Design a protein around this ligand. Structure first.
Ligand SMILES: Cc1ncc(COP(=O)(O)O)c(CNCCP(=O)(O)O)c1O
Ligand SMILES: Cc1ncc(COP(=O)(O)O)c(CNCCP(=O)(O)O)c1O
Ligand SMILES: [Cl-]
Lengths: 363, 363
């Protein structure tokens, strides 16, 4: 019943959920070859039109895939450069800390875009960096980060590039081979519009090969997981979330049917721009300037009316069939509205009407 | 439902457990965290013990991620593990300790043998550096039921922390983890509870779980941090959880209560397993283990010694009749397995025995 205006888990189509009504055996080819290997093939082609890439699927939250990448790719003498401008870049630094990996972090603040000169300066002044981690859509605020110039700078400096594309892959066109991304992480449940249960890594095969024997976790051993899928035709070393994987297979078919990432991006971009215009017509201000907006999720300042309360606003909107999202900026009073999943222009129009009816602090 | 999965899990789930997945949830909303997650947590502790002092943590990923979260979070920098290795899951515990650089002494009596309490006792007495012990309750490798009471009792007498891998027993074999002196019991969403895969869980003695704070070797698998967030944020999972699989689990817990609880499920499983063994013997099949070592969960049988017998051909012929059996997992034994859990009833075992006979192409 609710329309979830979240970044994911979000409102999935009826067919994506119905695809979960079948049980699968984890040791049978009908699952491994017919479902898993197909997802792997499709994911690589979605990420790039070029050769040399491969995919690995990993059980757990998308954070477990980010952690599997960091912990498996970085050697004993490695150092990670993190571009931190929100919770996800900060979480990458936190993973490095847990795994005792030295970290250089450029942290301009949660509402600031990192400048190319900041990444270039870190690379030029710290030769110990071996790896660079960047976030494509910083979901914290919904900022769209300029990943091309950062990846380009890192590659020119001979670094391995890790991209957290959790909230962008499948909704924002990117060719990870052209961008020079060595490891791209993304989610089953955001722009692809599947359900949560696993994440995945699309990696340059020669870079993934270097991960062998370097892992800091058995569950999160990226090369071991990949090797098993490679030689055992899709087999996950340990139990996988079968139903969610089959839902993902369905989500990939619906993305092809929509017209691919280009068509999905166009829908998302139209939803986001329509939402921003609608919100401005009601007196809401986006937290970020329009040039920094992603087409995925948008942060808005909380109304400054003395009677405004997020909980009361959230409840009134839920009563009208819409679930909005908490702000994630520690120094700003804000909220978020995603426009992905089963969200179409007609939904944005109904939403704007519902937000006006939920503005209890105004006649 | 083309097949009945005679696997240890993922298995054949009820229609209501799968139908429960047809709803989307917001990971930041109380209708999911308080109404679904906190209820599962409360129910899981009461299922594990009738006593106070215990708590639960849910962890995204395979059950292995939960075992690894326990080992990596519970064991300090100077800790040492004693593990009984009498199958693949005891061996995997030793492998996790190796990945995490945790000193580990394995007691390996063989995969068709129960650990000798004298060897365990001697290993404990002669090595005061051991801080932790681990054992697998139902060794799914063979379907062996391990003697956990005497093992846990010996470890407790030696002042050790007891870890129980009850992946394939919890919910199908009556146990009171407080009475047994288990400090951490790991189990999964998709075995005797009959949910779908997606997450595992740990039921721990609260005072023991508290010692895990700050000791974790993984952010994703930080047991105390995951628990603390669920405790103070009313069910909130730090990172995205497999919502649909969690809601399916909530439904699986209701169906276990409706069945008559662990006592009734155990009785069904015991009857299934004993009926299956008698049926298999009538066809000339020999179980790997002596009857006194059988768990009521899954049974391993020796491969027929006919020169034309091949597991793949037998497996296919059974699939054609609507049954999915399971490959053998024993070191130095040619064998196969048949689970009798999930939506498996006496009438299914009877149909299975008929189907096994029709699949005996070499006779
Ligand atoms: C950009 C970005 N990177 C990582 C993650 C973490 O994904 P998981 O929650 O671990 O699957 C996210 C997640 N954002 C949506 C979930 P939230 O609870 O709001 O963090 C992300 O956007
Ligand atoms: C006793 C026991 N311990 C751990 C596990 C591992 O669980 P996950 O596969 O990681 O969820 C199991 C699993 N057995 C069933 C799956 P299989 O592919 O046969 O290992 C277990 O039984
Ligand atoms: Cl419901």
């Amino acid at each position: 019943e609710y329309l979830l205006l979240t970044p994911g888990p979000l409102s999935t189509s009826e067919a994506v959920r119905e695809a979960m009504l079948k049980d699968w055996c984890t040791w049978d080819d009908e699952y491994n070859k017919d479902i898993v290997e197909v997802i792997r093939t499709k994911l690589v082609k979605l990420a790039t039109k070029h050769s040399g890439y491969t995919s690995v699927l990993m059980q757990g939250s998308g954070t477990a895939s980010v952690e599997a990448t960091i912990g498996s790719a970085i050697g004993k003498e490695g150092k990670l450069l993190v571009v931190d401008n929100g919770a996800y870049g900060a979480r990458i630094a936190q993973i490095a800390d847990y795994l005792n990996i030295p970290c250089h972090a450029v942290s301009p603040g949660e509402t600031s875009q990192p400048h190319l000169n900041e990444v270039e300066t870190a690379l030029a002044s710290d030769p110990a960096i071996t790896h660079v981690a960047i976030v494509h859509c910083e979901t914290t605020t919904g900022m769209l980060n300029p990943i091309e110039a950062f990846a380009s700078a890192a590659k020119a400096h001979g670094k391995v590039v890790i991209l957290d594309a959790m909230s962008s892959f499948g909704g924002i066109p990117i060719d990870i081979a052209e961008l020079g991304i060595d490891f791209m992480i993304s989610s089953a449940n955001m722009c692809i519009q599947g359900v949560p249960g696993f994440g995945f890594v699309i990696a340059k095969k020669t870079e993934l090969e270097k991960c062998q024997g370097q892992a800091r976790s058995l569950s999160l051993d990226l090369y071991d997981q990949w090797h098993c899928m490679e030689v055992n035709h899709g087999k996950w070393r340990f139990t996988s979330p079968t139903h969610t994987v089959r839902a993902f297979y369905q989500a990939l078919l619906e993305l092809e049917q929509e017209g691919g990432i280009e068509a999905r991006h166009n829908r998302y971009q139209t939803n986001q721009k329509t939402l921003v215009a609608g919100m401005r017509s009601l007196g809401f201000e986006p937290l970020l300037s329009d040039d920094l907006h992603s087409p995925i999720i948008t942060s808005f300042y909380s109304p400054t009316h003395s009677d405004y309360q997020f909980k009361a606003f959230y409840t009134r909107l839920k009563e009208q069939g819409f679930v909005i999202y908490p702000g994630k900026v520690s120094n700003a009073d804000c909220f978020r509205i995603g426009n992905i999943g089963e969200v179409y222009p007609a939904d944005i129009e109904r939403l704007i009407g519902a937000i006006e009816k939920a503005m209890y602090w105004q006649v």
